[PDB]
């Protein structure tokens, strides 16, 4: 309800690959995350998260945030949320199946 524009973790029109270079910029580590809106389909969001290193190389994972008919969102069908704000605080409390706990907004 326009409440995403002040969020430090929200990035408007940001592509998957721009999310990766953003999350690999200096100042980020595992847990660094952003939510981005898809550039083609307005209203469909992704979660991008700086993961644990693999084989001394940096890793960034991506998750589709899916849309409920009732307006809510979910990543895993085991737990659904009324908005992105509750989704973000839930995965900041625990990884709960994500590669890593959300720990810090992506630093620019």
């Amino acid at each position: 309800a326009n409440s995403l524009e002040p969020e430090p973790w929200f990035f408007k029109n940001l592509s998957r690959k721009d999310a990766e270079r953003q999350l690999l910029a200096p100042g980020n580590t595992h847990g660094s995350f952003l939510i981005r809106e898809s550039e083609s389909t307005a209203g469909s969001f992704s979660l991008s998260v700086r993961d644990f290193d693999q084989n001394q190389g940096e890793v960034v994972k991506h998750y589709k945030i899916r849309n409920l008919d009732n307006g809510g969102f979910y990543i895993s069908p085991r737990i659904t949320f009324p908005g992105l704000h509750e989704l973000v605080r839930h995965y900041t409390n625990a990884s709960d199946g994500l590669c890593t706990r959300l720990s810090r907004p992506c630093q620019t």
Binding site: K61, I75, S76, R78, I79, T80
Partner: protein, 92 residues
């Protein structure tokens, strides 16, 4: 124990599956159904919602000769934890 119970395929073509399950006693507003090739990581599965009043669903656009894992998640509230999911495997 899971909600729903008795997930089974009840029809198949090389590119689609119809699934049905035992109507639950408990309240269900909506199901979330995921499907994808067995072995693939869950974050790449497809997913879609069916209303809590249906007890069947159609999954289409599949590739023939592939092992799919199909999981049904029942939600008793608008938002929150699902019941324990129920899951089956089937090859097209």
């Amino acid at each position: 124990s899971s909600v729903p119970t008795k997930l089974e395929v009840v029809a198949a073509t090389p590119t689609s599956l119809l699934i049905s399950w035992d109507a639950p006693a408990v309240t269900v507003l909506y199901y979330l159904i995921t499907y994808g090739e067995t072995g693939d990581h869950w974050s790449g599965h497809q997913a879609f919602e069916v209303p809590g009043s249906k007890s069947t669903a159609t999954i289409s656009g599949l590739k023939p000769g592939v092992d799919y894992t199909i999981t049904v998640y029942a939600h008793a509230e608008s938002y929150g934890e699902s019941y324990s999911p129920i899951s089956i495997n089937y090859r097209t």
